[PDB]
Symmetry: D2
Subunit: 472 residues, 4 copies
């Protein structure tokens, strides 16, 4: 049972708008909106949305497998060895937010300070002492973006596994000789970094020039979560404010996915006439190019919605009914909707491109969608005994070598419950980089944006005040 | 009574190394080491130091006044108007860590997200609604370092006040016409940004080509805190590990200041022979150029200690007794002392150049000295009733317009207790940028590095584990 | 009769290797190698070649028309107006080496100092006084590559004409309103600069993703000049030195074009067995990425000649029989062939990418192919009376208003003999930028590289010594 | 007899404005204006001047010796060895325009294409074969400004000699061990590049913070050429156009030098009242920061001429009588004087900063002052037999080993007549980089700007038309 199975289960449930039932529904962690910084919903004038893995959650592991398979085939068609075709996507290996080190070919799970929490070369997990040969301080400078690539999105799950597959394959195939920084086969040297670049290239290609989109759109029920409660939440948002879409995808893919997401024999609730997806938005903007969108952006263009092509020239007109924008910048949205940043709640899944950058560059309020949180919550409650235990050993240790080895033993047993790369949010008692960025930049977060439906629209989301150590 | 008065009071006290007295001395917040992240002192192999405002704490307000007066005189000598000479430094105005906005000429106190906490144009404090003309979202992008200058060090206290003085002067002198971005006097236009640059230039000049150093060294007792407990702590550090100095100052100024700091008729404790300051360090490095020091650094040079000049050429030799280094990089220290970053506790006062950058670029452990914390602690306890009260109003509000105006009333009354720009760490219930960077990058912090003397050298500094909202 | 008609006429002639006939053949300017700097052919160890418009000269105007037509269709398919389809390529308009000014939408012919020789907005030729509104000093800074694009290659001939077509079309179509920097149609503004970028984009697309290559290769006799004397010259070069190919084109296109260029029922001369084109080269390198090739280059790869794909990884082996390289740099050629720059004669048509950059960055000897020189020579002799006349008027003027207007009259009449944009090399008595770069960077130049066949291979090409004015 | 001796001889001669005497005076090459491109003097509306080595020609070798001696002393005071004090400036060694190679420590004389004409390591002249170890192609990429420094100005003459001195000293002093890229003395390594940087630093320091200016101004007759014909030429220029000064020097040095240059008991001619130097200029601009001046420039400031300090703020007013500008840009001059670039004749000595950059960036007409041309002309006529001979050997060679060795023999004998580094303009029959830049960017050139006095102010300076090889 995958995380998208939990989300699809909640999606099949109709909305009971009885206020008592609503309060009791955000009872369960699965349906709750979690709060990092207080947010007064009556001060929110505009609700903005990302599409992919926000409004349109791709089913797991079917969609990752599709991307993995088409990426492998692209690599084989440009000349990678045939044995790649016998790989098969395995969802229990990759955790999101890992760092690939293009120098040594390792996948790393790190904390906010770049300390190593897990190191895996292929499928071989390097333990503390052996990592010191390559990482003398058990630390990487995360901001060295020329060496380290952070696999931040659910789109990166297939290549996370594929990178491990490839390193494992070349390490153990006798045609190749392993070196510190890559593999040699006679007079051809393949560095982990050029191997990495071919994988990124092939993933991009499959999304943009290959057949991934076509195969998605040809079987949307297999690949995309559908929820009748989405029209309801959007129409309620429109009753108190403005609603906009700002997505990196192009207009033709956006129209196909969105049409499907609203494809019900009714509108906002059963019994009402169905309405086109565009009628739920005061502003629709595609080809956003986030995060650049939150700085200088690009030239504001206008989509010809009959053809799906951009009209020629820069659009200099006003907001008008029916218009669909391409490019522009976050200032386009503020001007056209008459909003200041703190009036805006932007809802997305990209911790960097949607959340970090809109917060830091523009002062937008932020809501981070974490689709895996559905399952992570299940594991966290179910095996809370393991963590509760672990908490106590570190306090026993505070007040010796026999303790530490069981610290490492239950850390391992706790982490294995999530997958081979452990929880998205921690390794034992150590929080990941990803968890720390959630806390720092996501004002609100939840397994699904739909959890906002279970809150009255004047609700004050409350977080506790932070105190420095000396202020306690 | 200034913050340096508190530190000078503690400095006059001899050390009682009775273990029971030591534990009871770190009783008081003034003498405590505060913990953001746990640190096991037995794992620390090297203790490293900054000099200025770390080992050598300049007395306040005498030293700020000296810098203010010499900066004003430099500005007048290059042609600023004579009325500047009637300014006098006023320590109750500036709080450290303010942002000067070179576009509109405002001093701003902001939180970690660049939201405005205080806005002052000259000595005129702009309240919420009027700030929206210039800051529509009550927010600045802190990383726009071309527009915003963060006044992060105690060296910036005089220019913080001077900037306010100048803006106030030109605003109210009838020879000048105020515009949005500066002042015009006939055919000469002075922008706030070029005004700002002249102030930075003049401060630099006074430190490097003017008479500030000479006047400091000519009356060290007037300007520099001296503490007989410093030799004692350093010699105890040398018993368990290595000790190094890495300072941006040059060798001649370093030798004059350090000689004074050790100028007692005894060595580590009363009764012992006095020893030169250099004997307390396994490695001495000047002209460090931090934070560049924590990246590529500069060429490693060797000081000729008889002349105070650099020897010609790059030093390629080994660490040897008596040698004094200039330039180099943090890797110089790791190689020469045989250390990894997490073996090192670096002790300094520059939140960016000493602490943030050594943590992020190198994984060093960090100890931040905050000299004002002496007084900030006094105010915080004394008027805790105000804050305790404020805490309760926000909870009353959580469960209306009459409440909010008293929220703003006690925020004001609390803040005025610290100075006109409020506490270094907060404005009411909102933490400053500076406070948030302390928590994020300073593993330990204290009013003085000397507070380490009151802890056994196997002490485990303990911080509580962090939990995400959904993990609670 | 086009310039490629002259070249095709000379190509149909078999070689008479009788030494007396050879000397009398380089009699005629059409068959001569012209000398800017002396070059001793016995000191040349390596002859290197470009392919497109050097070994493979595309027939004019058929090939330009094909490129024009496919570029127009691409523009229409992305949304430019239908009227574009009624354009037809006109070879009498464009001269090579014009500068497009993306700010004002003008085609400009300039001298070496950026002085205006001709200015055309669409098909409207702006005369001196009116150009001063937009060019106050009748001058452009050529190196402002963000504003000015120099149309340096014969590949740019179709877009040179197309740019003029488009500006003319939008200027005179009543649906659009002309502004200084572009055209507006209601709420869409098209700047000349974005119009320019769409044209560049469409030309690139047609060459790399469209059908230009396919349609070329499907009718090579229609589009490519073929000359039985090419195998002969290459085999003679191989008798005294080494021969290499370094081309920006990929391997599959290179193999198709080169196979055709050698497709004769004989080898070097009639009666000899035919040999594959690859046997004429000691080193074959594709995907050169010149001019970057003459600096850092790119990673050296190896072509799989059976599949036309690159082998995976960097090629680290030696030069070996049969190998085909991709990428690398000019140093690859020097190392693998054991050559220094002055040992190398590089033969190409790109005045910047082949000639200027190999000379300045590497000290290579250079031979510039100028296909239009065939016709330019014909016009220059035929109407030498006009130029001879013009020469005399400027001397009459040296020793008044009545003279100047006839100066401008015969300048016009001379220039019209070449085309609407005049000679490649001059406008009246003023040399173009292009002519000055030929003289400065092309050691040798000729209508065709084949003219080297008419010179013994110890020939000393001789240029006169240059004297400064004061040395005369 | 130095080149400044020739100029001082011509300067002592009073002006005979008899038109017949004027024509017969520009008879002699010493007094002629040489023409690279035709220039019609009646089209010149503004004459602009540089000061140093243009209006104010420093006497040779006295001034170079002064700069050499103060530079050596600065190097010794920062720690270079005492033996430097026994160096003495030797004017027969350095020729202007040499390239210092910071990697290998060689002085190089190169042509326009970066081919080696002379290579000297210290005082050791490397002949052809041995240079190939370090320069395999006998060529340098001149534009690699990180490795190569071109010593373009007469200010660089002392450091040209000093660099050779130092390399020679360290090579032959037994305390130091020579390596490929520098010198080692135990544990200190001095690279030629850091040695080079210390020399540049010391030259800058001596001009800007040392005592060079003071010692110049204290004995102007010893150091500066004075010519009573300068007021006369400037006043005649003012009769037909506008005159401006644009100099990099500051106002106080400019006023001292200019006052001296006009210090005669008369004005423009004997018998007329003396006038202040400022009255000869319609526009005076100091701190020009050329060549940046010809691009974005700097902020336009106004000099307070009573104090010599800049007024505070940007000057936004109009041109007015008495005003002195600081900074700004070339556009300041065009706007304030109502001129277009081709209306302007700019007169200076810096081939890059004055001539190349004003021509290429702005289309100004250019007049290059070459003070050494006085002596170079003398040598060129006197020993024309050597060159005339050399010309004939290369023609004998064109139509063998015995010839070449005498080619090299007379090249050497010709070059030695100029100095150890040969003529500024050539080595034998090969023109230098400097000569080629004179021809390309200096429309006019002369030993002194004063030679313009011998031409009527409607004179058409005439250069011959350039023809490409195929046009002959
Ligand atoms: Mg998304
Ligand atoms: Mg400090
Ligand atoms: Mg070509
Ligand atoms: Mg000068």
């Amino acid at each position: 049972t995958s995380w998208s199975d939990r989300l699809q289960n909640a999606a099949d449930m109709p909305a009971n708008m009885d206020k008592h039932a609503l309060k009791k529904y955000r009872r369960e962690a699965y349906h709750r909106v979690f709060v990092n910084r207080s947010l007064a919903m009556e001060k929110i004038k505009c609700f903005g949305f990302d599409m992919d893995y926000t409004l349109a959650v791709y089913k797991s592991p079917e969609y990752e497998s599709l991307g993995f398979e088409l990426t492998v085939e692209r690599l084989v068609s440009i000349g990678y060895p045939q044995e790649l075709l016998s790989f098969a996507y395995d969802s229990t290996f990759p955790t999101r937010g890992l760092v690939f080190d293009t120098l040594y070919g390792n996948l790393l799970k790190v904390d906010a300070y770049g300390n190593l929490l897990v190191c895996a070369h292929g499928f071989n997990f390097i333990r503390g002492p052996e990592t010191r040969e390559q990482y003398p301080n058990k630390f990487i400078q995360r901001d060295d973006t020329e060496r380290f690539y952070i696999l931040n999105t659910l789109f990166n799950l297939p290549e996370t596994y594929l990178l491990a597959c490839l390193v494992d394959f070349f390490t153990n195939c006798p045609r190749y000789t392993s070196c510190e920084t890559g593999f040699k086969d006679g007079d051809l040297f393949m560095s982990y970094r050029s191997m990495f670049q071919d994988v990124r290239d092939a993933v991009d290609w499959v999304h943009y020039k290959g057949s991934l989109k076509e195969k998605t759109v040809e079987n949307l029920e297999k690949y995309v979560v559908k929820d009748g409660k989405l029209p309801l939440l959007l129409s309620r948002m429109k009753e108190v404010g403005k609603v906009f879409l700002a997505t990196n995808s192009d207009y033709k893919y956006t129209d196909k996915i969105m049409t499907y997401l609203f494809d019900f024999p009714h509108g906002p609730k059963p019994g009402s006439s169905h309405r086109p997806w565009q009628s739920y938005f005061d502003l629709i903007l595609v080809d956003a190019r986030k995060p650049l969108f939150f700085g200088e952006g690009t030239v504001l263009r206008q989509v010809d919605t009959k053809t799906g092509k951009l009209k020629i020239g820069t659009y200099t007109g006003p907001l008008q009914h029916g218009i669909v924008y391409s490019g522009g910048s976050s200032d386009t949205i503020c001007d056209l909707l008459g909003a200041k940043g703190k009036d805006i709640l932007y809802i997305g899944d990209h911790i960097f491109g949607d959340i970090l950058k809109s917060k830091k560059r523009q002062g937008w309020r932020t809501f981070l969608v974490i689709p895996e949180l559905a399952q992570e919550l299940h594991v966290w409650t179910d095996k809370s005994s393991l963590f509760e235990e672990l908490q106590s050993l570190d306090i026993f240790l505070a007040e010796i070598s026999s303790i530490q080895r069981r610290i490492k033993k239950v850390t391992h047993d706790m982490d294995m419950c999530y997958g081979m790369m452990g929880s998205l949010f921690r390794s034992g008692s150590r929080q990941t980089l990803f968890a720390s960025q959630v806390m720092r930049y996501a004002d609100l977060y939840a397994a699904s944006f739909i959890n906002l439906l279970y809150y009255p629209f004047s609700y004050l989301f409350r977080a506790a005040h932070v105190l420095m150590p000396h202020e306690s």
